[model samples]
Target: FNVSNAELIVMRVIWSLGEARVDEIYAQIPQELEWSLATVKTLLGRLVKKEMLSTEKEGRKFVYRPLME
Candidate 1:
């Protein structure tokens, strides 16, 4: 799977944490990124669409985890 530079930011978070919610990922994001919640979610959605990330629904939140390469 192709991982973009921007998407890599999210990927690393999931890699370190195993699984992450949007807020949790946001909390750990590097200051250089300056990403908003919407941007993070959009990036996550793209990763999911690209099959780089898998999502599990947890009531109001969607937990994201890395998929096997």
Candidate 2:
């Protein structure tokens, strides 16, 4: 899906779990990234724009899903 390592990790979690919230995705990121929650949010935002991530509004929290195989 031509994603950054951070973005790739985020997508893998969604693909692995089928769907995930921002917090869930953040927690799954590997230690090598050493990224903060804010960084996760930013990466998700970019992935959404790139259409690598499909987002759904689940009440107040948003769930992210993978758009690529």
Candidate 3:
């Protein structure tokens, strides 16, 4: 599967952390990117759609894990 640059950015962060929630991933995003929380969430949803990520619900939070290396 091919991920765009923005999606790859999100993916790399998750990869580094092993797994993460939206806020956790957002906090770790590169400062140079200047992306919004909504953007990160959207990218994560797209990755889920692409089957590159798997999500498990933890109460009100959803933890995400990469399905790819």
Estimate TM-scores for all models.
Answer: 0.75, 0.74, 0.76
Per-residue lDDT tens digits for candidate 2, residues 14-35, read 7877888867788787778777
lDDT per residue (tens digit) for residues 1-69 in model 1: 863545556676678878887678778776687777788877777777876778887758878787674
Local error of candidate 3 at 60, Å? Answer: 3.0
The global Cα lDDT (0 to 1) of model 2 is: 0.75
- Local distance difference test, per candidate? 0.74, 0.75, 0.77
For residues 1-69, could you state the per-residue lDDT of candidate 3 as single tens digits?
873545467776777778798678788776697788888888878788876788888758988887654
RMSD of each: 3.2, 3.5, 3.2
Best-to-worst ranking by TM-score? 3, 1, 2
Better of 1 and 2 by lDDT: 2
Instruction: Output the number of the TM-score-best candidate.
Output: 3
Q: Model 3 Cα RMSD, Å?
A: 3.2
Clashing pairs in 3: none
